[model samples]
Target: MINYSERIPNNVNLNENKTLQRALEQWQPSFLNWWDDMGPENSSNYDVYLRTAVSVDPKGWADFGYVKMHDYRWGIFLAPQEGEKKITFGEHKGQDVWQEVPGEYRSTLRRIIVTQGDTEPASVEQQRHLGLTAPSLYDLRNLFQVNVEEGRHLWAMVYLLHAHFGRDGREEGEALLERRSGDEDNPRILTAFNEKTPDWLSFFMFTFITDRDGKFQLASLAESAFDPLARTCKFMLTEEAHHLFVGESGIARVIQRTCEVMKELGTDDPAKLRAAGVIDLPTLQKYLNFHYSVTSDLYGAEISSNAATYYTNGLKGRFEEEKIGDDHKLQNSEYEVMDVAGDKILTRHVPALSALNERLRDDWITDVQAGVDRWNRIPAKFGFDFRFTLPHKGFHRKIGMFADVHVSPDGRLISEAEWTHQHKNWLPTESDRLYVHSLMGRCLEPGKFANWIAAPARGINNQPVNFEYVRFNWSHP
Candidate 1:
């Protein structure tokens, strides 16, 4: 069970370490202040039904109840450790994993930790306004659930900082609170995090594509030589499983509603579908195009010295590094990656170590393609002749090889003037955003959804579809 007696509800035995506990006690206030200033707008008054971790055991760990958004036990939880574990890949392969940060690798490890940690709070900030437009009590509850868990994940990263990184770590932890998503002077560390979740549609796509990025990222870090980092990421991955589901299932539900309407109304025109209060298939493809391309940039450049160095130094590993049969040391290994060769997308060979980011991106595409294939079945099952396609890696990218050129969803090189004329159809135009925003407006009725989306077949945690998932204007004694 979580140790609630301590100031911080944690499974890491924080009370036993006086120095770290005291430091965290000081930092906790700043975190709460950030939460209040930047969390879900006007949502502090409700009792939201959310899942809290009763233990870090990975089994029977969740306990569900109504809780004020302000009272969540945002605590530190590391997965249980093995008796003796060896570094699985990298130069340190087969060596005993470092229990503490190594002196030479100090800066690199801290940078990695800080980069990962910054994302935790940035996600919460990006989604702060979404509560105002939720479609139903069920969806509202899930939004709050995703928010609080992200807060706890921030706590998880801060624990590593105060316990290990010294004075510099504490300062960096506080700086994490100061930065805001999309703020002019202090925007988020990553560009994608700074972008807005303007509506539930964007929210679903963000969680589907962006949170899936987090899954692959955390998996790679879980294979690190630094044991604490590995253990921390290991626990975070368990929570990430639900988030990935939220996105994939949320999108599937939308497709389900649109297809049902198409079958019933006997019309496929965009104007007719809009009249019926559902998103059309082409508009859905444009949304998919925008989110998918922006997320691909998060993987960094196609050939990165930084990625190569991280692997060689043993601070990071490939996605599922151990699953591949290699020498575990790429002294002379080559992998294929793409680049534009004068209006033609051509593939070339490079050291696998340098192409880690691309390899990871490829792995991500494989997983995402599976989900897209799943989403297509819904429309096809209703006898519609349409499918959603993930845009090519080069289409609309802002980083790496395709940053300067224009590539279409079907993977053709186009002139800048051509891109200017057709981009509105390729991405979500302003008119599209306004139309979607008009469809959603604080839908809070129990057991009911908005006009544009479909309801899930079941409720969260076996509650009825109309369960009072949120109790408004809650107060404490």
Candidate 2:
């Protein structure tokens, strides 16, 4: 039996809901087993400097401590609902908001919740081995922070399943633990999550790019008509911002180190840059191109009826749906979508509701560009003539409208052979992966970082960079 009073730190009042409590308690050990099997490698014995959320108030939401990864208090937390919220958009607009799943929308709601739940664990599985090669103790701690929080996020979703969806939802919760990230028989639901985070560069890029996709997706869900789901996603977004920061700053440090080497060598040639033991601007651009495209595909088809149904039914909404200056309903509105016809990319207006995915993707691109602009400034400040640009959406897409098309990064239609010839140039090649992999040696000393990356300007949470971020206590059996 689990003690809701202390064992699970939740704001959901799990103690009173004995049936729901029993369901989650029954599911808990399997979750622990999965964490032991697929969580960060070689990290079981460390007392990591991590944050545990004990409340939902912005003023005093979390406390810092050294907790072993297995013992970290993962729990359910929903942002406190403001007074008497209503369904903001959809067919049920202006309804006082649902406290329980409406029967008609039950499956739709379950599908959305399950899909979101699956991604949380998929990411942990993808990066499980990264701790073995972390560049610094600081970086290693950040990775564990991300891993555990992702675990908690899964808990947040499972709480919904067990509390709201009944037996089927409980079964779904169990399956969430069963699916391996890249397993042949039971892979993760999404294509991007199944991909490997084999090196720190890719890991950083995943956080920066793919995790940003999560940010957008969660933001849309935050506006959901299902009040519980809306509140849950709202809180998840707060934790997501830190993951984004880790990625953005981690890459910034990598670029900072690369620029220093480029200036020292007084050259930007790729071969010479590699020989100097730093990732070059061009290779970074290739990584950016690859990750950006993969992340972009997460938005689904540019014009999807499923997206339309989600919007019309009020299961999801546009990014920052309330702040947009328009009628809350998008029935008659039209949004411009890029149309690919025989050799040229053109734009045509589609019904705004059907174009919901594109609108969110546009918002995401704007957000991504802001970060890219910040990254570009690093090289420019160093007086280097290099710049990083996101590739055209049509390039390298494996889902949605552009999946069948072969377009160049600069947006020209190309033959399959041409794409094959230039794919290595556009994306990370075998040699590029080899070189990045070679730089994956671990650096556990508090203040030290591997040569391929620069040290962060300061430490986490106001401590000095040399603080013992991760204290290891290995056990031999």
Candidate 3:
């Protein structure tokens, strides 16, 4: 039985729910077992300076301290409820939000909750080894911070399952701990989550592109008519912003360093740049293309009846639901969708509700482009001629209408032979991966950074670059 009286920091009045307490207590050991086996590698005794949430208030949500990762406080927190908030969209519009799962939508709600929960642990598993090769203690600390927060996010979703979905939800919660990111026997639910984060470059890109998908997904879910789900995702979104910051700023510094090297060496040639120990603009562009396409696939098929049903029945909503100016119900609306017609790309109108995934994706594309533009500014301000751009939506797609066709980054249809021939130029080749891997040697000394990447302009939480972000106990038993 759970000593809910003393364990688990939660705002949900967890002590009152005896059955949920028992279920969580049963699940807790396996979660720690998974963490020990698959969490950050060789980091058991380090006292990392990290942020832990203390309250849900905007003014005092977090406090900074030094603590070992295993002892980090993992808890459940929901955004405080609005005063009798009403459903803002879909068929259930105008009705007071649901406090309990509706029997009619039980399976649908459970599936969404489980799928969301699955990604939380999968990410921690994928990036577990990254700490070993960190460029600086600052970067290593950021990686662990992101890791622990992801653990807390899993707790948020698991709380929902044990509290509402009953026995089936408990099974799903256990299965979440059972599956590994890329295991053949029990792989993660999403293809992108199953992919490796072997290098820091890939790690930054995953946080930038892949985790941004989590941002939009959570934003949409934050508007859910199921009030508990809505409030849970709302709080999760706050911690999520920091993950995006790590990715965007980390990559920005990478480009800043590359541009400095190009200026010093006086050439943009790939061989010269690689020999100088910096990632070139062209390779950065290839990485951008690959990560962008894989992350975009998470939105699912462009035309989905299930997406329509989620909206019509009041399960999910468009990103920033209150800001869009249209009828809350999307019955008679049309959204433009891109399709391959013979030899050219054409836009056609589809029912707005059925095209909900595409609409949300369009919003995501806009958001992604803004971040890319910020990355481009670093090179531009430093006098580099190159600018990064996202690959065409049709290029390298494995899902939706574009999956069957071969399209180039510039938006032309091409034969697979042509795609294969030019693939080395458009994406990272075997040699590219090798060179990036070779640069992965760890840099652990305080105030120093790896040669391949630049130092951040400032430090985490206003500390100096040389500040001891991670204090490792060298002789731990």
Candidate 4:
């Protein structure tokens, strides 16, 4: 169980490790300051119905209650350690799992942790203003929930740094809070993260596409030979699942409401749907195209030496590395990697060891396709032929073999002129963004949702649909 009595709530015995506990205590003030400035906008006083982690046990892991955003207990919790666990993959197979950072792997491990840690807060910063335009109090509370949980996720990686990496870890911890997302000079580590989430549609898409990326990344990290990092990520995955749920269910409800609108109007025409104050399927696809392609870059270049090095050193493993029936080390195995030859996209097998990024990306795409399939069902059941599609992996790519060329959503190699003519249909244009933003009027009344989205089928934590998820003392008498 987590020790809530302490200033920093944690399941780890902070009292026993005086030095590490003190370091985290010192870091907490800066983190609070960052949250005040960069977290959900003007949301500090809202009493949000949020889930607070109480234990690592599966039965009672979280306690649900209303808590002010600022006073929510942000803590470090790791999944329970597995005894006698050995490195299960890579060149270091069969070695004792590391409880402390090994000297040779310290720099590499710390850099990875910091990069991951940096993203947790970067997302919060990118999304700070979203609560202002939220469509419902339920959604506002959900946004705050994601923000605060992300803040706690930052604490976990920072804990790994402070506990294992010594003074350098402390500096990185401070840097995690210092860098601004989307800043002109010092932006978040990844380019995708630096882009603003301009509206709720984009927010749902961001969470759907981007947090799915987070799941894969965390799943890979959970297999690390470094036991502490692995356990930290395992626990983080529990929180990450809800972030994905918000995106998945959020998008589904939007489709449901639009489907409701379409049948009421007896048409599927885009203009009529727009006039009806509901989003059309084609616009949803364009946003999907933009978010999906941008997030594809977050996986990094298809062929990554860094990925190869990490896997070989037992620093990171593939998603669910243990389940695949194979020689754990990809010593002589080959995997197909996408390539471009003269305007045509093709795939050829490369040494699996060097192609870990593509491999992980393949696993991620399979998962993404499954979600898109779920969304596709929503429109299909509504009797509309409109379906969501995952654009070709090479489409609008920025860091891969297809980056220099133009590939269409359906996987075609098009000339630059053709792309210029057809791109507006495939990606969200300024007009599309403006229209979406226009519909983002706040809906604060309990159990009510804006015209663009439908209320969720159920409320958070078994509460009634009309529950006061966010109580605004300042906004009301």
TM-score of 3: 0.97
lDDT comparison, 1 vs 3, better candidate: 3
* lDDT tens per residue, model 2, 1-477: 122246888788888989989999999999999999999987778899998887787534567888899998897899897788888887777878778998999999999999999999999999999998999999999999999999998999999998899999999999999899989999999999999888999999999988899999999999999889999999999999999999999999999999999889899898998897899989999999999998999998898899999888889988998888778788888999998888778989999998888999999999999999999999899877889998887999988778888989998889989998889989999999999897789999879999999999888878899899999886521
**Where does model 2 exceed 4 Å of error?**
1-5, 475-477
* Model 2 TM-score (2 dp): 0.97
Worst 10 residues of 1 by lDDT: 1-10
Candidate 2: minimum summed lDDT over ten consecutive residues — where? Answer: 1-10
Better by lDDT, candidate 4 or 2: 2
lDDT of each: 0.88, 0.90, 0.90, 0.89
lDDT of 1 by residue, 59-98 (tens): 4367788888888877788878888899887788889888
Native-to-model Cα distance after best TM-score fit, residue 220 in candidate 3, in Å: 0.5
How many times do residue backbones clash in model 2? 0
Candidate 4 per-residue C-alpha lDDT over 95-210 given as tens digits, one digit per residue, 9 for 90 to 100: 99988888998899998999899889988998999888889989998999999899998999999999998899999998888789988888899999899898999999999999
Q: For residue 305, what is the lDDT in candidate 3? A: 99
Off by over 4 Å in 1: 1-6, 58-60, 474-477
What are the C-alpha RMSDs, in order, of all predicted structures?
1.6, 2.1, 2.4, 1.5
lDDT of 3 by residue, 1-477 (tens): 112234677788887988889899899888888888999998889999998775677544666778898887788889998897999999989999999999999999999999999999999999999998999999999999999999998889988999999888899888899899999999999999999987999999999888999999999999999999999999998888999999998899889889999999999998999998999889988888889999999999999999999999999989999998999898999999999877788889999999999998889999999999999888789877799998888889999999998899998899879998997889888889999998888899999889888898888767899999999998893
Q: How big is the positional error of residue 101 in model 1, measured in Å on the Cα after superposition? A: 0.3
Q: How many residue pairs clash in each candidate at the backbone level?
A: 0, 0, 0, 0
